[PDB]
C-alpha cells in the first residue's frame, strides 16, 4: 500500500481503486497512486463512487473473477460482493441504464 496516506489534494481523472488495508483505499489516477483513509469506515464508498464511471469491464471482472461478468456491489466498508437485481444502481459496478452506442 501507500506510505503517504492522507497528504494528496483531490485527484481528477482516476481509473482504478484498490483495497490495501481495511481502512485505506488507493485510487490509481494519472498522477500516481493517491491513497485516502477517512475517520470512519462505511464512508469509503463516498470516495470510490466518484470514479466508478471510469472503470472498464476487465478491471471489474478481475476485481471478482468468480462472479462471471455480473455487476458488482460496493459494500460500505469498501468490499466487493456480487450484485443483486434489487440493489441500488448508483452503488453497482458495470451495470448501465442506457447502452452508449453509435453508428459509423
Amino acid at each position: 500500500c501507500c506510505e503517504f496516506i492522507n497528504v494528496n489534494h483531490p485527484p481528477e481523472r482516476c481509473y482504478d481503486f484498490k483495497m490495501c488495508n481495511r481502512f485505506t483505499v488507493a485510487l490509481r489516477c494519472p498522477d500516481g497512486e493517491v491513497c485516502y483513509s477517512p475517520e470512519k469506515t462505511a464512508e469509503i464508498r463516498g470516495i470510490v463512487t466518484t470514479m466508478t464511471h471510469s472503470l472498464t469491464r476487465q478491471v471489474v471482472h478481475n476485481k471478482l473473477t468468480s462472479c462471471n461478468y455480473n455487476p458488482l456491489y460496493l459494500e460500505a466498508d469498501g468490499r466487493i460482493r456480487c450484485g443483486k437485481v434489487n440493489d441500488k444502481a448508483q452503488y453497482l459496478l458495470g451495470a448501465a441504464g442506457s447502452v452508449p452506442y453509435r453508428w459509423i
Epitope: 492522507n6 481502512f23 483513509s37 470512519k40 462505511a42
Partner: antibody
Framework: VHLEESGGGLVKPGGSLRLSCVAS????????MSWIRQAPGKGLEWLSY????????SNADSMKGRFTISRDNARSSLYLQVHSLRVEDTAVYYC????????????????WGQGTLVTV | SALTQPPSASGTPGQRVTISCSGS????????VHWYQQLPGTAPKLLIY???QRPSGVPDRFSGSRSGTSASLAISGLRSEDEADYYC???????????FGTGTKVTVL
C-alpha cells in the same frame, strides 16, 4: 492557516453567549470545522462538527440538546451557542479545522485554535 | 469519554513511553484512532492522524499502533518537551460521534 476564537470570560448563570472562531489562510468554503470544550482538570470531550456548507451533526450520548453550531461562510466563521449556562459549563473552548475530501472527513483536527475560557 | 486509558505514566530522558487506549467493537473496531498531544498551557496538537501516520512537523520517534479494538502510542527517546497530556480519539457508530480518551500523563524526570 490560523484560527482565532473570541466570546468568553465571566458570564452569569442562566444566560447565553456565542463563541466565535475566525479562519485565515484559506477561503474555499469546504471546511468540516468542529468545536471541543474542555473543563478544568484537563479533560477533552467532543462536542460537535458541521458540514462544509450544510447541516450540523448532534452531540454524543452523554448529554444532548444544549449545543448548536452555526456557520457564516461569507465571514468563513464558526459559532457555538449553548442553550443554558450551567455552572459545570465553565470550560475552555477550541475550534478545529477539518478539510474534507470528496465530502467525507480526512485529517481530523489537524489545526486547533487558541482556547477561549468561559467562567460561569 | 468512553475510551479508557490509564491515568499516568513515567519515564527517563531518552527512554520509551507506551500509552494504551482501549475501547470496544463499536468505536475502534470500525473507525480510525487519532492521537493528540497537548503541552501544558498550549492548544492541543495532532500527533498521529491515522492508525500509523505522522503529520509534517512531528518527529519520527512518535509511533502509532493498532490491535483489534485498541491502540498504542509509543514515544522513543523521551525528552523534556514530551512532558504533555495525550488523548486518543475514535469515531463511534453506535453513539454516532467522536469519542476521546480519559487522558494520560507522561512525566520525564
Amino acid at each position: 492557516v490560523h484560527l482565532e476564537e473570541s466570546g468568553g470570560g465571566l458570564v452569569k448563570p442562566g444566560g447565553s453567549l456565542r463563541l466565535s472562531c475566525v479562519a485565515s489562510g484559506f477561503s474555499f468554503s469546504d471546511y468540516y470545522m468542529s468545536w471541543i470544550r474542555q473543563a478544568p482538570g484537563k479533560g477533552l470531550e467532543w462536542l460537535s462538527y458541521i458540514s462544509p456548507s450544510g447541516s450540523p451533526t448532534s452531540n454524543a450520548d452523554s448529554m444532548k440538546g444544549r449545543f448548536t453550531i452555526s456557520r457564516d461562510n461569507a465571514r468563513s466563521s464558526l459559532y457555538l451557542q449553548v442553550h443554558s449556562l450551567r455552572v459545570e459549563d465553565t470550560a475552555v473552548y477550541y475550534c478545529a479545522r477539518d478539510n474534507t475530501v470528496f465530502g467525507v472527513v480526512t485529517t481530523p483536527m489537524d489545526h486547533w485554535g487558541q482556547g477561549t475560557l468561559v467562567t460561569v | 469519554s468512553a475510551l479508557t486509558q490509564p491515568p499516568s505514566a513515567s519515564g527517563t530522558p531518552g527512554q520509551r513511553v507506551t500509552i494504551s487506549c482501549s475501547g470496544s467493537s463499536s468505536n475502534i473496531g470500525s473507525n480510525t484512532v487519532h492521537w493528540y498531544q497537548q503541552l501544558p498551557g498550549t492548544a492541543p496538537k495532532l500527533l498521529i492522524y491515522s492508525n500509523n501516520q505522522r503529520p509534517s512537523g512531528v518527529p519520527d520517534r512518535f509511533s502509532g499502533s493498532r490491535s483489534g479494538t485498541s491502540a498504542s502510542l509509543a514515544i522513543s527517546g523521551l525528552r523534556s518537551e514530551d512532558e504533555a497530556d495525550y488523548y486518543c480519539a475514535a469515531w463511534d457508530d453506535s453513539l454516532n460521534g467522536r469519542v476521546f480518551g480519559t487522558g494520560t500523563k507522561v512525566t520525564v524526570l
